[PDB]
Amino acid sequence: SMSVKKPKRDDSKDLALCSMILTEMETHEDAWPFLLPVNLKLVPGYKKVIKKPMDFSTIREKLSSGQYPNLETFALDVRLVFDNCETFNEDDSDIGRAGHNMRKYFEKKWTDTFK
Ligand SMILES: CC(=O)Nc1ccc(O)cc1
User: Fold this and answer.
1) Locate the Bromo domain: which residues?
2) Which atom belonging to ligand 1 lies closest to the Cα atom of 88?
3) To test ligand 1's pocket by mutation, which of 25, 38, 59, 97 has the most ligand atoms within 8 angstroms of CB?
4) Is the dihedral angle over the CA atoms 44, 42, 30, 62 positive or is it negative?
5) Which CATH number belongs to the domain containing residue 52 in this structure?
């Protein structure tokens, strides 16, 4: 509360660490469905169904231009990519399996890096 503070966690390296994690996700062999935005003009259903599209290139642009106020807002956009993928794709599809794999990959990096 007013004039009563928790000890300050060192967040000075957060931007650099999130960038390293994103680089590792960009270079994963299963990253190909998530590198660029889904083409809303060529994929039926996607625009109406998926209310907040997100992809790695869009996350990279936001990270590079100061659009994440903190760690957690970054993780929210990464998870959104995989939540969108589950909504639109069957678990037993190539893109469906890719999404499950990349989510597992991310969450281990997230825990190891910040927890
Ligand atoms: C991330 C994603 O769902 N991509 C995607 C899914 C189906 C399709 O026909 C074209 C692209």
Assistant:
1) 9-113
2) 3
3) 38
4) negative
5) 1.20.920.10
